Amino acid sequence: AYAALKDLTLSKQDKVFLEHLMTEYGFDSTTARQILKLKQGLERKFSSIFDDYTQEERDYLLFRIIGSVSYNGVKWDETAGYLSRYFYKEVVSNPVTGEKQKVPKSLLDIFQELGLSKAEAKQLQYNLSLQHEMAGGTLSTTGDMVKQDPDYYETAKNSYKLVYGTTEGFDKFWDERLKAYSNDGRGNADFTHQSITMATHLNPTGWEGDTTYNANERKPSIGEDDYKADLDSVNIIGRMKKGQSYQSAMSSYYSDVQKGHSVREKEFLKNKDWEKVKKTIYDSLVPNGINKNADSVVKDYIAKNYPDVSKFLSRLESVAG
Ligand SMILES: [Ca+2]
Ligand SMILES: [Ca+2]
Ligand SMILES: [Ca+2]
């Protein structure tokens, strides 16, 4: 655990970054180092010294690629941007003409272009999806899965063998990852959710989608994993806009979160007006028959019908004063 990061052969800044990935989301050193490998591939592919790209574009690409594990399809391409603009293979499309066409690269092929081996790419994708599904603390140990949903258990087991090549150790692995990714059931930030939120905010062309009736999703849904992801997206993007890279801003932010008190909520309320947040959620969730000025009535309505959004409001209200 501690023993893994002594030798390495990473800058002090990179080790700090790896440790934040591990602490905040639950990744072990193996997965965290694979995420660092992706980032290093982006710097080799999109230079600011030998080419034209910027650090913010490289940070966007990292968020966009990690997000695509869980958020894909044309609805997300229009929203967070098309990865095919940056990752493709060209093939002769008409043998007589010589005309070529650019064929979009799959997510696993993007991972390998950026430096991961085929096995590393499969492991990274799997662990990013696991963290995404487990972060909210709604999933079960294999021991409870067997009894409750035996078909989900054998499905999950098959996915693990697909990745690692064996069924051996699935129960121990799943239970170990469930404790780490879910923060022992209490909730960690949903990393792919945070990533696609940040990618969307950095696309040249979050909490609001999760707290309102937007079309696409399951209505409002803001479990603890999305609460942290949504607020941390806004906070870290804000630090980046002030001049920091993603690695610097997230390192400074998670350090500050540890050193302070309710820093996640206080910093969110400095980026987003508490009254605008309240108003956005009220207009979307509260029917016109309820006087929105009668704040005690509204809070009891939300508390009864949207317990997750209620906690979201209670936590911010608490720090708004
Ligand atoms: Ca989530
Ligand atoms: Ca402000
Ligand atoms: Ca209801």
Residue numbers in the entry: 212 to 416, 435 to 550
Provide the authors' own sentences about this structure as they appear in the paper.
Analogous to characteristic antimicrobial polymorphic toxins of Gram-negative bacteria, the LXG proteins consist of a conserved N-terminal domain (LXG), a middle domain of variable length, and a C-terminal variable toxin domain. We show here that LXG proteins transit the Esx secretion system of Streptococcus intermedius (Si) and function as antibacterial toxins that mediate contact-dependent interspecies antagonism. The genome of SiB196 encodes two additional LXG proteins, which we named TelA and TelC. We discovered that TelC, a protein lacking characterized homologs, adopts a previously unobserved fold and catalyzes degradation of the cell wall precursor molecule lipid II.
To gain further insight into TelC function, we determined the crystal structure of TelCtox to 2.0 Å resolution. The structure of TelCtox represents a new fold; it is comprised of distinct and largely α-helical N- and C-terminal lobes. The single β element of TelCtox is a hairpin that protrudes from the N-terminal lobe. Although TelCtox does not share significant similarity to previously determined structures, we located its putative active site within a shallow groove that separates the N- and C-terminal lobes. This region contains a calcium ion bound to several residues that comprise the conserved aspartate-rich motif. The substrates may be inaccessible or TelC could be inactive in the cytoplasm. It is worth noting that TelC contains a calcium ion bound at the interface of its N- and C-terminal lobes. Analysis of the reaction products showed that TelCtox cleaves lipid II – severing the molecule at the phosphoester linkage to undecaprenyl. Our experiments showed that TelCtox is capable of hydrolyzing cleaved undecaprenyl derivatives but displays a strict requirement for the pyrophosphate group, indicating the potential for TelC to simultaneously disrupt two critical Gram-positive cell wall polymers. S. aureus cells expressing extracellularly-targeted TelCtox exhibited significantly reduced viability, and when examined microscopically, displayed a cessation of cell growth followed by lysis that was not observed in control cells. Consistent with its ability to inhibit a conserved step in peptidoglycan biosynthesis, TelC exhibited toxicity towards diverse Gram-positive species including Si, S. aureus and E. faecalis.
